[PDB]
Structures are given as structure tokens and as C-alpha cells.
Symmetry: C5
Subunit: 235 residues, 5 copies
């Protein structure tokens, strides 16, 4: 398999109780520093050395997710440390995270059609859906014990689903074997959140997932631009 | 395929009685008045027909209160969530659990009986019961690997039980595949709590649930009107 | 599959915040304990009029320091006890660690009374089970449990007569411990995370270990029982609460 | 099944941050109170009413374990409450605990049996604790086995512990009805590698291989009362 | 089913409390960083006299920020390092998030040395594996694991000759990533919650994903492996600390 950018899903909850105690002046300074940090990220993306986006997560799991993509673990780890060193980061409590690397099955690494997948531009879709997953190794339902022939056939039929949801849902698959607790981090983008439920359900009735898919938690959110972050942190 | 309605937020909170006690009577009253106006705007959204909301006092240590909110978009639902947390009193309402889903039903949308289910008016029943569930995918007991006909039969016989409790137990089924950790969010309303125990027990002896259902935690509570909030928060 | 249901129950486990408690002066500790004694006397009044029950046991281990087992005829009454308790000044030092909600349950697998076109709730023998007076046994044992639904071992796919047989044989063991162990079975399907909440009372702790062990070799439990956490404790009277909260 | 002393495994973590903020004056006073506490524990030991020991645990699970044995649940709980009421206990955060009773699958007045039911804790250099239960999962159901089969398994299992005798001392505490697992196993040895050897060897015997379910494992080093002041001294 | 055992191991995962650390002035932060430096210099001495090893990596994600992998020849020494570490003033800002105790292990499935009535612990080649020098690779990968004992897939019920074949085929994959991935196998049966603590080192993190994936398709792991949490990190030298702890 061919690998692309290293990915970080960073889920945060806003400590409103502490944030409320800050005067408007200091709240302004911390947001000013954040905007500067966000402009930094934008520059890295403009030179094609990374990607990033922010979505507001629903429910008590988190308030925000910071999805970041970079060319190396060193180039990903300093973003994480640089972010935590921000003043406002004290009010962004860690609730969950995920580490992965963009994954995909004559040089392919120059094929500009393949580059668009390994180093994907993040679409500004209204909504986002994230969940980790793994392939089962339980009794008769053991994905990794399947023959090469049958196992590939399951992947074939599975791919036809996402193929049918083209223009409705965009997927980013990140392998996490050796990097995190599950085997894949799946990120979905769409302007209609209902499409997330439809594709994952339709997938769940397909044998590939119906028999071998193990799922972690599901996180769903809405697009959050810089022009929306200010009113968000304004009580 | 299914039909979807309002997006749902079950927001469970525990009351920080230790912290709340430290507030003088004056400050406690101001925060209640701020909450009162918040609920007033919730009532506006309810009247205009762009959602619903209700509050119940939960029994046990899982929570003290549940804020069940329904809206016509995820943006609107996240708005209520953040706006709620920005309240002064919210600092004393600690998050213990939450669930995200959308009202689900298996043209119809302009059929005045269907929309009544997809956009349900919350009845002022004396008790509520909530629990998340999922259909199992474990060996011989795999719901999503069953033939279509066998599935319909199991759903059919399951449906027979629900209609037998009509007039005693009102249900709201919220699909959460792609939205949360389980596959459905079940909400029951009844004036007799024991009806919850009767319908869920009877269901559990039906094959659809007996063989294929997985259950999360169960939350039961009592109806709490806005007028009774002042008395509740008075030590 | 049918049940007779009595009092709604609350097992309220609490841990004592000794760090915060030792900061109060004896005068303030006295006022809080005074308010608690009043609260507990209120509970006793409800008991004396036959509209509920309550008891306190000291739990061993880090799971909890105290359990407050309370029984009431409605969830509105039960919740009110809960809210009223937390509003106590001393409750700020009683940290929640675990709880359970159930209702006293009598299943119809075996009979509890003669069936003669007759109202069971008027049967005093039945009422003594539905609305049980709590015995002042020296020790308590609580654990939630459920019936498995796992492949070949699926309790809820069994025929009625087969479940009857299993409950019957299970019962034989249960009644061999009559006079040594008293049992309160609370159904919690639809009310909590497990399907039942079992409370045992005895003047000898080892009896808890004996009955549960012997049950575990009986097919009803050996094959179909799924257990949660176990809690063991000692009876705590009001006349030794002041000694407990005194450092 | 014969039953002896009631047991408490009390695992604690040291709040170094809060402990550091205390000036050495308070720290010494709290350590003195703990010394008087442990002094009274030794009296109970010498008269023959109970036992106690302390071990420094490795890893983040805990820093210390207080293993206490008493004749009744009243006395055990009293020590537990007496311990928490100590000023120093505020800096000893609870991380894990276990309740059991010394189990032995008129014998009660025989010195030989009493040595088992009411065991003196050896001052071995190391300790190992883990809870466990017997499986009731599908075809692997220990409690649905015929007695004759179950007896042979226990017999084949017993042979292992006896070969490790003198190198590893074991205290089995039954916890059915008392805690979340069915047994609490405590091992003592002057060589921690012996723990790894006996548990490994046991796990290949059909009794544990097929029917054992384990909880968390805790390893620690012997810690005397005189070593506490230098442990808590930064 | 014997093993050769070397240094006792401690993986100490920590997270940086940036909020509290920020409140500290650079004068005090400097002082704590200096104390940490003297601590690591003492660790270097122990390493130079040959009484153990130690290294530090920066973990990615919220699981941790740092891991302090330490190796010693006794549990007394290993626990003293642990106690000394926490007694550091800077340690208050290093919150414990996870840990794993184990000992460097060589299984007897395949031979590590030739026969001869010849003590293996005197073999220079064996000692190099039991008391391994930590390679300064760019990245690290740690994960605990255990062999399954679930129904048909029961590793500990397998015949010896079958476990051998499985480990043999398993070893071929590991031996194929030579010069790219170095492995430290720490046995933890009786020491921690899993049966092994596996530590990988490589200058290319993708090799971790490559080896574990290929391994997971081999029957030994495809059928019998149980995995815990995975931790991925970047190498961090003592001179890089002050850089890291500068806001
Ligand atoms: K949120
Ligand atoms: K409550
Ligand atoms: K206790
Ligand atoms: K430790
Ligand atoms: K990190």
C-alpha cells in the first residue's frame, strides 16, 4: 500500500467555566494569537506541504475537532506542541485524538491522480464525520485469515458503495496499524449529514463490514471558519 | 431506505451542589433568570415549528437532569448546545452523558401522518426512558447478514409489540449510525414507569431483540417543568 | 415473563471526602451531622407509616464508604429523597461512586399465592415480599446481574417450561438458605444497566460467599448469569455515625 | 471450602504535587501519625488477631499496597476507616482495592490448617497480586463441568504450585460475593522472575489455559516501616 | 516453555501540563529543567557503568507527550528511578497517562545459541539481546499484547510443535525487516496486564505500519494475537528539552 500525509484528529472541549473568568481584553489577545496560528497553518497549505480544517462537534464528546495533515511525524508533532503552547489552548481540554497516515492501494507517487488522494485537499463541506475501525479476528469471522482471492472480492464490492456516493460523500482513509488503537481512521465530508448515515448503513449491510467491521466512537460536526470562531468564544 | 426528521440531542447533566451552595441567594437568582430566558427562546422555537424540547429529572447518580432537544438542522442543534453551555448556571451543570441521533421511520413527507412521527410533539408524560441500542454482528447471530425476508419478519413481529402498548407508551426512534456510538436512540414516554419495564421485557423475549439486540445504559426520570426549576435549585 | 412489582428502589453508594471534611471545625461538623439526623428521622417516619424503607451499611474497599438503600412507592418520592439528600451540607462530603435503580420484583415462574380469580396485592404474604421490611442483619451484599444472550447460551430464546425448570432448580438452593440469608430481588429492565439488582442480608458474611458459589454451579447461573460488581458491607446505625465522622 | 481471615488489598498512589506543597513540618507530623498507626498494627499481629504488610508497587497503577488481614469485617473496615482518617491518607489516592477471605478448598482448631487460614505474611523481597475467575463462556464453562473432570483439572493444577514451593508462597482469597472477581491471588518470592515462571507454566495447564480469566497484575517490592520517612522525603 | 530474561523494563508515559507550567516564570522553569538535566546525567552514568539503559521519545496525540523508557537489572533499582523521577519538581507538570512493567525476554522456541552444556548468560551474543543498547532511531513504537485463549483459537492449548511452527513462520517476517526495524521483546506475564510489551525502533515510521500489518496476516497473529494501545513517537535528546518546555 502507498502512504501519504500523516494525520492528526484533535478533539477538544471548551472549558467555559474558566474562559468566563477572563476579561474581554485577555479573551481578545488569546483569539488574536489563535488567528496568527491559523494563518500559519494556511500558509503551509498554500505551499502544498499540509492541510487542516476545523469543525464544531456535537454532543459532550467534544466541542471542536482540529484535523491536521503534514508530511512527517516531526512536522505533525510540533504543530501539536505549538498548538498546546497557545494561551487559549489552556481552555481547550483534550477529550480524544487519533493518529494515522493517508492510505491507498511506472511511478505512482508522481501520478497526479494518485497525489490528489495521498495528499488530499480538504473540501469545505458543511459537515464532517469521523470514526476509527478495524477488521475482525474472531472465530469464523477472521478477515486476516481469509484467502487472498475472497478477501479482495470483499474490498471490490465495498468500493462500489463509496463509488455510488460520489458527489454526496468524500472519504479520507487513514491507516493506523502500528500508529493507533484501531486499524483505520475514516473521515467523511458532506453538505448533508444524513448522507453519512446512509452510506455507513448501506456499508454495514455489505458483507465486508457486515461480518468483519469493528467500530469505535462516532464524531459528527459542522464546518467552522475563522469568521465563526470569534462569536463562538464570545459569551 | 428510511425517512428522517428532526435531529436530536439528549443532554444529561449532574448538578454541582457543592459549588452551587457557595453562591449567595442573589447570584443564584440571576443565573436562574438567565436560564428562564433561555428556555423561553426554546419555547419560541417550539411554537414556530422548528423543533421541540423537554426536561426530566433523572433518577440515580448517572445524572440529575436530561435536556432532550430536537431541531431541524445540526447547526441549530449545536447552537442550542453552545448557547446552553455559555449560561452562567451551566458551570454548575456537569456533563455526564450525551447522545446524538435523528428521528427515523421505515409522497410520505407531505403525508400529514408521517410528519407527525418524524417531527414529534413531545407529550407531557410523567416519566421518560432512554437507552441506546444496536443490532448485533456476532457469529451465527448477525442481523446485517440475514436475508431481507427474515429481517422483515423479525421487524414485523417486533412492531406488533410496540403497537400493543399504544396509548400507554409513546416511542421515538432515532437513528444514530454515523452520528453516535450505538445504532439507535430509543426514547419512551409513559405516565406509568412500570410500562417501560413491561414493554422492554416483552421485547426481549421476541427474537428480534432476544437474539440480535445490544443495549447501552438505561436512563429513567420524571417530568420537570420550568416553574419547578426555582424550587429544585433552592437549598 | 409476567411480574408483580412493589417499591421502587435506590442503592446510593458514597465515598467520604475525608480531606475536605477534616478542614471543618468541630462546630460546623456538628451542625451538618445535626441536619443529617433530622433527615434520617424523616426517613424513619415514612417507614413507620408503611410507605417506604431505608437502611445504611458501611461498605468495604474503595468502591464506597457508605450505601444508602432506600425504598419508596413512587419514582417522584424516590427522586425527592435523592435531591433532598444532596442538598444536605454533609452531602458535599459524600461523593457518588455508584448507584442502582430497581423495583421489588416477584416473577410468575413459580407461584406466590393460590390462583383463584383473586388480587395478589391484597395478599399480606405477597405484600410482605413486595414491600419488604428491611432486617437489621449485621452484613449486606449487593450485585447487579443479567441473563446472557450469547449464542447457544441465550436465556431469552429458551421455551417457557425450560426457563421454569432452571428458575425452579435455582430456587431450591435459594430456599435452603432461608433463616441464614434474606433476599430482595429488584427488577431493573428499563430502569438501569443490568436486568436485576440483588440484595442479600445476613449476620454471617461467609453465607453470601456460600450461597452465590452454590448458585454458580447451578445451570441457571452457571450458563446464563452475567454479573456486575459486588459490594460487601456492615450495618451502620445512627448511634455510630457520629463516631464514624469523628476524626 | 474452609474460610479464614478477611483480606484487604489497598493500593494507593502518592500525590507528590500536593505532598511537595506541604512544608517539612507537617510532613513529619503526618509520618509520625502513620508510624503510630503501623505500631498498633504490629500489636494486633503479635497477639494473633491479624496480619499486615506493605510493598512498593512498580508503574503508574500504584506506589504502595497495604495488605491487611483481620478476623472480622468489622475489624477490617475499622482499620480501613482508621487508615483514611490519617492526615497523610489525603496524599494517598485510592487507585485499586480488593476484598476477599483466606480460602482453603474440627479442622479450624488444627495448627496445621490454621497456618493456612490465618497465614503469617513472609517478608519476601517481592509481592505479586492479581484477581481471577473461572470462565463460563460457551464450550469453555468451568461451572458446567462434571465434578470428576473439574477435580482432575484442580489436581493437575495443584502439582505446579507444589513444585514452586519454597520459591513461591501463595495466599488464595475467595471473593465470590465479596468482589468483582472470584479469587484474589497473592504471591511472595525473593525473585520476581519466579512469578513470571509459575504464572506462565500454570497458563499452559488446561485448568488456566482453557478456563482462567485474569484481572490486572501488580508487582511490588518489600517496604518496612522504617523506610517510609526516606520514601516520602524529597 | 522456558525463557532467558535480562533487564527489567519501565515504559513511563507522561503528558505535559502546559496550563500550570505556563504560570511559572522562566527563572523557576529553568531551575526545574536543570534538576531534570542532572537526573538524566545520573541515568547516563548508570548506562555507562553498564547497569541499565534509558531513552526518551515524544509521543504523538493525546495519549501522551513523552515516554521515558528505562531498563535496569533489578526491580529495586527500577522502582528507585521511578520514585526519583516523581520527586523532581518538574514531574508535577508531567502527568502519568500510562505505564508498562516487563523484562527483556528470549523464548526457547528457536535456539539463540548452540548447545554444549554451555551457560547462555555467558554468551556475548545473548547478553547483547538481554541487555540491549538502545538504538538512537528517529522513531519508536510501543504496544502490549497477549495470546488468545478463546474457543477454537486457544494458543495455550496448542501442542508445543504447533506453537513452534507458528513462532517460526512469525520470526521470518521479523527477521525480514532487519536493518529497518529493531525489536525489544519484554515479557510481562505476572508483571502487568498483558503478556508482552513490544518496542520497535526505526528511522522510518512507515516500517512500523508495514511490519505489524504483514505480521497480522501471519496466522500466529491473525488468529491468536490480542493487541492493546499503540504509541508512536519521535526521538528527543536531553539538549532538546529546554526547547520543548519553552512557551
Ligand atoms: K458540543
Ligand atoms: K439523580
Ligand atoms: K470503604
Ligand atoms: K510506582
Ligand atoms: K503529544
Amino acid at each position: 500500500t502507498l502512504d501519504g500525509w500523516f494525520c492528526l484528529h484533535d478533539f477538544r472541549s471548551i472549558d467555559w467555566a474558566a474562559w468566563r473568568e477572563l476579561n474581554p481584553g485577555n479573551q481578545e489577545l488569546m483569539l488574536n494569537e489563535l488567528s496568527h496560528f491559523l494563518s500559519d497553518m494556511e500558509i503551509t497549505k498554500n505551499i502544498g506541504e499540509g492541510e487542516h480544517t476545523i469543525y464544531s462537534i456535537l454532543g459532550q464528546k467534544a466541542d471542536l475537532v482540529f484535523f491536521t495533515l503534514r508530511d512527517s511525524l516531526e512536522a505533525l508533532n510540533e504543530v501539536e506542541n505549538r498548538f498546546n503552547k497557545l494561551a487559549i489552548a489552556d481552555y481547550l481540554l483534550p477529550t480524544y485524538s487519533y493518529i494515522s497516515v493517508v492510505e491507498l492501494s511506472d511511478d505512482p507517487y508522481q501520478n497526479k491522480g494518485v497525489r490528489a488522494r495521498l495528499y488530499p485537499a480538504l473540501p469545505p463541506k458543511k459537515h464532517i464525520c469521523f470514526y476509527p475501525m478495524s477488521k475482525k479476528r474472531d472465530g469464523a469471522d477472521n478477515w486476516y485469515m481469509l484467502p487472498m482471492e475472497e478477501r479482495q472480492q470483499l474490498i471490490r464490492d465495498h468500493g462500489l458503495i463509496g463509488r455510488s456516493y460520489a458527489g454526496k460523500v468524500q472519504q479520507i482513509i487513514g491507516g493506523s496499524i502500528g500508529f493507533d488503537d484501531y486499524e483505520w481512521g475514516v473521515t467523511l465530508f458532506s453538505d448533508d449529514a444524513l448522507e453519512f448515515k446512509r452510506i455507513v448503513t448501506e456499508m454495514r449491510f455489505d458483507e465486508a463490514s457486515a461480518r468483519y467491521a469493528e467500530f469505535g466512537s462516532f464524531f459528527i460536526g459542522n464546518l467552522l471558519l475563522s469568521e465563526q470562531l470569534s462569536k463562538l468564544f464570545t459569551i
